[PDB]
């Protein structure tokens, strides 16, 4: 069993349950580089100058990770600039690819530093404070094989309901029924396809998890039905923090049953987030997990079929301890007359209390009757929150798939939900960031993923949103989302709405193909998006391409990500058909041979490339997933080619039936 994977154990590792496959502890010396326990733990490896390093799932910068530093330490940071070392995810899988090729999974739940050529260009160094971890070494002939080995042992990826392959609209600010009705009307009356509207935190009663503002929604199930009758499914948010409030059932049950994270003295740790003071459910405690997950029944019973989990790093605006320190410092500042306490020292203190490393040392988890300080298992919180929900869905309705995705994650969580790429910005560079994160996430098991289209923070423009949407066409999560106070970002808020209808039409025409590829990849522990080097390993030009991706085994995508651009350069590793969905509803095709090309792609055109000897089915445009006609779709691509289409009811879990597959021949 497991010939190509070995597990090297150091110290007394916390069981993260990342792997579903049990691997015995190897007894020989670590097989690559050098291991040191002199100062905590460190792995050091000298790379060949041609080596490529893949992996790290949701992390900064590019597909080839060489040339910077990455720290796995789930952090709420809304400014994703090139300098940042830590985002929301901790995905500790890397592959060194070159003359010598191997994969490593560092199963460690705390702060883990990947120095990938940052300090010295030839040096890979992975280090942490405590030598209590399992390291899995995965052997293979090439990077792709190694990923496929890893994907097997971590267990099958989460599978969403088919409606989740539609388009979704979201905004931090939708509050009332009139707000949601205006979104519904803005899309439906302009014939723009859409299947989901997300409800952000304002739908709750005073930000209380598992409540609904009954002044705004006096009969919430009727409203959910009003929307669902128009094939619009409401997707509400759930946050990590449970408001401290007398008589609020979730809070009262958590205190009484000791389901919250505690301080050293056993009192319930107070974290201030949106509701003000809150407690955090002890996500690492099975009983607390079951309790918290069960609460989703509150919304499910009202007709809700999907959720998103937010703030689950967990984010902290301040603790009671931090606020007191802050107010004391402020007092000294206010009465200084000697210029001893400067305004930036005050400013620094205010910043310091947010997501404070000290705060993460102030609370504990109850695991196996043992108290574990949170910092030591920090990266497992978001993971276990989403696990709580996922495990509850199986108890609540085991026949049914629910839409579920989370902000923070760790490998293992991919079994229970997807992720969205968090708080990006209305920056052109974030289209590229969205693109590059995709294959890396697929390597670590996270297939259902995407970014806030148009950009979350700051102000978008008509053309940025259109180019963002055109990449979104291909990402399983396709959601336009925007921050409070930003320029309105709904498709109907711009001139010439027909261009938005055109781009989102392309998504819906491609839904049968994209869903089919997702399912075939998920069911077979394979990738939906792949770097070119996985498909064309013998092409030195191909292995270094980072702004094109292969999807399934049929197509390649290459989005435009420059403002004012009317096309872009591409490298084709084999002959392909260059395809564009045109604003008049037609599909243009042009055969292009292997090599470098500049392709013209207008703002309202959606491009893709179909590989030699392949074809894909394309449906006529429909305005919701339910209405897509998959009976005799048109086949686009090469004569003589065939395609195996996976199709099921999109709702239940009857995956292994011959009726789910049909061969289409062009
Ligand atoms: O502190 C902010 C909390 N949230 C962060 C999420 O990333 C974002 O998508 C969401 O709109 C927002 C409000 O719910």
């Amino acid at each position: 069993s497991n010939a190509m994977i070995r597990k090297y154990r150091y110290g007394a590792p916390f069981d993260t349950e990342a792997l579903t496959e049990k691997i015995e502890t190897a007894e020989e010396a670590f097989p690559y580089g050098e291991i040191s326990q002199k100062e905590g733990f460190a792995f050091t490896y000298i790379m060949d100058e041609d080596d490529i390093v893949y992996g790290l799932g949701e992390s900064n910068r590019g597909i080839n990770k060489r040339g910077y530093c990455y720290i796995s330490n789930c952090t709420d940071d809304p400014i994703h600039t090139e300098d940042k070392r830590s985002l929301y995810g901790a995905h500790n899988f890397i592959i060194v690819s070159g003359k010598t090729t191997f994969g490593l999974f560092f199963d460690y739940p705390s702060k883990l530093t990947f120095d990938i050529g940052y300090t010295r260009m030839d040096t890979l160094k992975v280090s942490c404070e405590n030598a209590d971890l399992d390291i899995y070494v995965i052997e293979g002939e090439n990077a792709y094989d190694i990923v496929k080995q890893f994907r097997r042992v971590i267990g099958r990826s989460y599978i969403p309901p088919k409606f989740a392959f539609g388009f979704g609209q979201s905004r931090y600010g939708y509050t009332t029924k009139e707000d949601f009705r205006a979104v519904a009307k803005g899309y439906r009356e302009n014939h723009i396809p859409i299947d989901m509207i997300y409800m952000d935190i304002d739908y709750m009663q005073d930000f209380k998890d598992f409540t609904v503002n009954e002044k705004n929604f006096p009969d919430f199930p009727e409203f959910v039905k009003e929307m669902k009758d128009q094939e619009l499914r409401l997707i509400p948010i759930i946050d990590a923090g449970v408001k401290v409030e007398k008589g609020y059932e979730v809070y009262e049950e958590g205190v009484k049953n000791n389901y919250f994270c505690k301080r050293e003295d056993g009192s319930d740790f107070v974290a201030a987030v949106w509701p003000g003071d809150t407690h955090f459910p002890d996500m690492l405690n099975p009983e607390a997990r079951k309790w918290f997950g069960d609460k989703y029944r509150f919304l499910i019973d009202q007709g809700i079929e999907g959720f998103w989990n937010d703030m689950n790093e967990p984010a902290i605006f301040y603790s009671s301890e931090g606020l007191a320190e802050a107010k004391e410092f402020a007092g000294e500042f206010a009465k200084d007359t000697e210029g001893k306490i400067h305004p930036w020292a005050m400013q620094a203190k205010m910043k310091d209390i947010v997501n404070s490393p000290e705060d993460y040392k102030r609370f504990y988890h109850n695991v196996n009757g043992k108290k574990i300080r949170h910092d030591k298992v920090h990266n497992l919180f978001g993971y276990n929150m989403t696990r709580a929900a996922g495990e509850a869905f199986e108890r609540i309705d085991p026949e049914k798939r629910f839409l579920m995705f989370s902000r923070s994650s760790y490998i293992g969580m991919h079994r229970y939900g997807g992720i969205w790429m968090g708080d990006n910005k209305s920056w052109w560079s974030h289209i590229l960031l969205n693109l590059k994160m995709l294959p890396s996430l697929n390597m670590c098991g996270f297939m259902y993923t995407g970014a806030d289209l148009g950009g979350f923070g700051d102000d978008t423009t008509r053309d940025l949103l259109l180019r963002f949407l055109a990449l979104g066409v291909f990402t399983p999560l396709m959601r336009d989302h925007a921050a409070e106070g930003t320029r309105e970002q709904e498709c109907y808020q711009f001139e010439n709405i027909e261009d938005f209808r055109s781009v989102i039409n392309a998504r819906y025409r491609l839904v049968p193909y994209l869903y089919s590829e997702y399912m075939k990849a998920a069911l077979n522990d394979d990738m939906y998006f792949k770097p070119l080097g996985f498909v064309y390993p013998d092409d030195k030009m191909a292995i270094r391409v980072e702004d094109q991706l292969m999807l399934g085994n049929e197509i390649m995508i290459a989005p435009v990500y420059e403002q004012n651009a009317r096309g872009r350069y591409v490298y084709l590793p084999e002959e392909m058909k260059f395809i564009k969905f045109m604003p008049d509803g037609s599909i243009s095709e042009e055969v292009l041979e292997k090599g470098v090309h500049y392709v013209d792609v207008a703002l309202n055109e959606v491009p893709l490339f179909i590989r030699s000897g392949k074809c894909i089915p394309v449906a006529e445009a429909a305005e919701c997933v339910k209405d897509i006609d998959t009976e005799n779709m048109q086949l686009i691509g090469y004569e003589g080619s065939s395609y195996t289409l996976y199709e099921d009811d999109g709702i239940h879990k009857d995956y292994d039936k011959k009726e789910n597959y049909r061969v289409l021949t062009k």
Side-chain angles (χ1 to χ4, degrees), residues 1-5 7-21 23 25-26 28-37 40-128 130-177 179-255 257-334 336-339 341-350 352-357 359-369 372-393 395-630 632-655 657-666:
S1 303
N2 306 291
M4 298 289 252
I5 303 165
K7 190 191 69 194
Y8 300 88
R9 176 156 287 179
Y10 297 89
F14 183 92
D15 187 3
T16 68
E17 302 175 81
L19 270 72
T20 58
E21 186 76 5
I23 309 286
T25 295
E28 79 282 352
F30 197 87
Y32 296 106
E34 290 183 30
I35 297 294
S36 178
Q37 343 217 11
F41 173 90
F43 163 71
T44 307
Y45 182 80
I46 305 292
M47 295 177 282
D48 179 74
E49 62 166 344
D50 288 334
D51 284 352
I52 292 168
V53 176
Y54 293 106
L56 296 180
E58 184 187 35
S59 73
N60 215 351
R61 305 214 172 185
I63 299 166
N64 182 357
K65 313 311 297 186
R66 291 186 75 160
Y68 205 55
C69 182
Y70 312 83
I71 303 167
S72 291
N73 183 19
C74 303
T75 301
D76 177 6
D77 186 344
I79 312 297
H80 308 174
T81 46
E82 294 184 37
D83 57 294
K84 299 305 175 64
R85 293 169 176 83
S86 294
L87 295 197
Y88 313 93
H91 302 141
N92 306 334
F93 177 46
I94 56 172
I95 303 97
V96 174
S97 178
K99 287 169 182 179
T100 297
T101 301
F102 55 95
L104 300 178
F105 173 50
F106 295 81
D107 198 5
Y108 178 72
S110 195
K111 180 148 130 177
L112 184 60
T113 302
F114 290 82
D115 184 331
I116 315 187
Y118 171 91
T119 302
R120 189 177 177 83
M121 286 190 60
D122 70 356
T123 300
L124 165 59
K125 188 170 125 157
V126 180
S127 58
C128 52
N130 301 111
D132 298 284
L133 67 162
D134 286 325
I135 304 183
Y136 294 81
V137 177
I138 305 194
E139 307 280 5
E141 301 184 74
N142 52 74
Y144 190 17
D145 275 6
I146 288 163
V147 170
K148 285 188 286 185
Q149 280 287 333
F150 190 59
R151 286 282 307 275
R152 176 179 59 84
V153 294
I154 66 175
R156 190 172 75 192
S157 296
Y158 159 78
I159 294 167
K162 194 186 185 182
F163 72 78
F165 272 84
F167 170 77
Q169 175 60 233
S170 185
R171 186 188 173 79
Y172 184 7
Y174 302 153
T175 300
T176 63
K177 293 184 298 203
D179 295 336
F180 288 98
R181 283 166 177 152
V183 176
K185 197 175 122 193
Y187 279 85
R188 290 276 182 252
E189 283 205 351
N190 288 292
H191 296 275
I192 305 168
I194 179 170
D195 269 86
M196 292 158 288
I197 306 176
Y198 290 77
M199 318 190 79
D200 212 321
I201 60 180
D202 296 309
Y203 83 90
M204 293 176 238
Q205 182 62 55
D206 292 292
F207 310 114
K208 286 184 288 188
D209 276 353
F210 313 111
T211 65
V212 167
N213 186 315
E214 288 179 348
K215 168 195 63 201
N216 290 339
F217 303 97
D219 194 336
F220 191 60
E222 261 283 79
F223 186 68
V224 170
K225 182 185 195 298
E226 169 184 337
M227 294 287 109
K228 199 186 296 191
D229 283 340
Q230 305 172 68
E231 294 296 322
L232 296 170
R233 285 166 171 83
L234 292 165
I235 314 294
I237 196 172
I238 296 287
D239 280 6
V242 171
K243 180 182 183 62
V244 178
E245 178 183 286
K246 182 179 246 299
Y248 163 47
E249 200 183 67
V250 187
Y251 163 77
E252 298 284 0
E253 288 171 3
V255 173
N257 294 281
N258 295 304
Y259 290 151
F260 291 133
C261 296
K262 291 154 182 303
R263 298 189 186 93
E264 195 200 20
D265 75 348
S267 61
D268 297 321
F269 173 74
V270 174
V273 297
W274 288 109
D277 291 345
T278 75
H279 295 321
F280 289 141
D282 193 343
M283 302 302 180
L284 298 189
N285 180 269
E287 294 75 34
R289 264 204 316 269
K290 191 203 143 178
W291 168 74
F292 184 83
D294 280 347
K295 296 298 187 187
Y296 285 75
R297 204 185 281 266
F298 165 75
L299 293 167
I300 291 171
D301 289 339
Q302 298 186 80
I304 298 298
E305 301 181 51
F307 307 92
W308 50 312
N309 284 345
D310 187 28
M311 304 292 277
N312 53 9
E313 291 73 30
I316 300 179
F317 296 167
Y318 61 85
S319 64
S320 313
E321 295 89 3
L323 182 68
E325 293 170 357
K327 281 177 171 177
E328 181 175 84
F329 191 85
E332 297 181 5
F333 173 60
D336 189 32
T337 54
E338 307 264 73
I341 305 167
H342 297 311
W344 38 96
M346 182 76 260
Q347 208 175 342
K349 179 54 188 188
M350 297 304 92
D352 203 56
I353 68 181
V354 184
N355 298 321
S356 174
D359 277 341
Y360 298 123
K361 296 186 184 186
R362 286 184 167 117
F363 62 102
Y364 297 75
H365 298 280
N366 175 8
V367 198
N368 323 122
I372 309 199
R373 208 176 63 188
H374 170 83
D375 60 313
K376 310 202 178 294
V377 286
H378 173 67
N379 296 335
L380 303 181
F381 191 98
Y383 166 20
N384 279 272
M385 180 179 175
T386 298
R387 177 177 174 189
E391 287 179 342
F393 299 156
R395 302 194 292 276
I396 292 177
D397 189 349
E399 288 180 73
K400 186 186 173 62
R401 291 178 253 172
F402 293 87
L403 174 53
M404 172 89 260
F405 59 89
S406 182
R407 195 165 74 168
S408 166
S409 71
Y410 182 89
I411 291 170
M413 200 201 83
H414 70 288
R415 293 192 295 273
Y416 307 95
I419 70 156
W420 90 99
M421 294 158 195
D423 295 347
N424 64 357
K425 291 280 201 178
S426 297
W427 295 347
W428 286 84
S429 60
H430 280 181
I431 297 180
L432 190 57
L433 184 63
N434 181 358
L435 183 81
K436 292 193 178 189
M437 282 181 175
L438 295 160
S440 303
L441 279 164
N442 273 254
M443 299 178 195
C444 302
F446 299 94
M447 306 176 55
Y448 189 80
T449 193
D452 285 351
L453 301 179
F456 180 68
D458 302 338
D459 302 311
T460 203
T461 59
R462 180 180 184 279
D463 56 318
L464 177 58
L465 180 56
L466 284 165
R467 290 295 195 197
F468 245 120
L469 293 166
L471 167 56
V473 158
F474 303 98
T475 63
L477 177 61
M478 189 189 185
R479 178 182 80 156
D480 177 335
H481 184 48
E484 71 168 345
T486 57
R487 177 196 187 160
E488 292 177 296
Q489 197 157 296
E490 296 81 18
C491 295
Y492 52 84
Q493 304 275 11
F494 300 92
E495 72 271 27
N496 299 123
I497 191 165
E498 61 272 17
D499 293 338
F500 293 87
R501 189 162 55 240
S502 297
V503 169
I504 300 177
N505 274 353
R507 163 68 160 210
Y508 277 70
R509 297 185 74 177
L510 285 171
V511 162
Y513 167 67
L514 299 172
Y515 177 70
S516 173
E517 291 307 304
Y518 186 102
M519 295 298 295
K520 296 189 309 190
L523 296 175
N524 289 289
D525 296 336
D526 208 336
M527 305 175 67
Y528 176 94
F529 280 119
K530 307 163 190 183
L532 261 70
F534 284 23
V535 180
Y536 307 98
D538 299 329
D539 181 331
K540 307 258 234 175
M541 175 75 190
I543 67 174
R544 306 213 175 257
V545 173
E546 291 202 16
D547 67 350
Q548 308 164 199
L549 296 174
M550 311 302 298
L551 199 167
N553 299 282
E554 299 69 33
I555 71 168
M556 178 173 74
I557 61 162
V560 175
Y561 56 90
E562 299 175 345
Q563 192 153 46
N564 293 314
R566 299 202 171 183
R568 55 159 284 172
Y569 301 101
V570 295
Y571 173 71
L572 306 209
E574 62 185 331
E575 183 193 285
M576 303 194 192
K577 282 186 173 189
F578 174 43
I579 300 305
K580 286 187 294 181
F581 286 86
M582 301 298 283
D584 74 346
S586 68
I587 301 172
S588 79
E589 334 175 340
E590 178 185 9
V591 179
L592 298 174
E593 283 174 330
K594 172 179 180 175
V596 176
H597 298 277
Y598 186 86
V599 292
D600 302 319
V601 184
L603 198 55
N604 56 4
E605 289 166 7
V606 177
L608 68 77
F609 300 81
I610 301 173
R611 299 165 56 174
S612 184
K614 302 289 167 64
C615 65
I616 60 174
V618 178
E620 303 302 314
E623 293 172 55
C624 62
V625 168
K626 187 195 73 190
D627 291 344
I628 303 173
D629 183 352
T630 68
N632 278 271
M633 296 174 279
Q634 152 184 34
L635 290 165
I636 307 289
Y638 285 82
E639 291 299 318
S641 72
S642 61
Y643 176 75
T644 299
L645 172 78
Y646 176 96
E647 178 177 280
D648 59 8
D649 74 4
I651 296 161
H652 308 101
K653 301 181 166 193
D654 198 5
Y655 303 132
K657 291 299 127 103
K658 67 177 168 284
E659 289 76 24
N660 292 349
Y661 299 85
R662 62 195 253 240
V663 177
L664 317 181
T665 306
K666 179 155 180 41

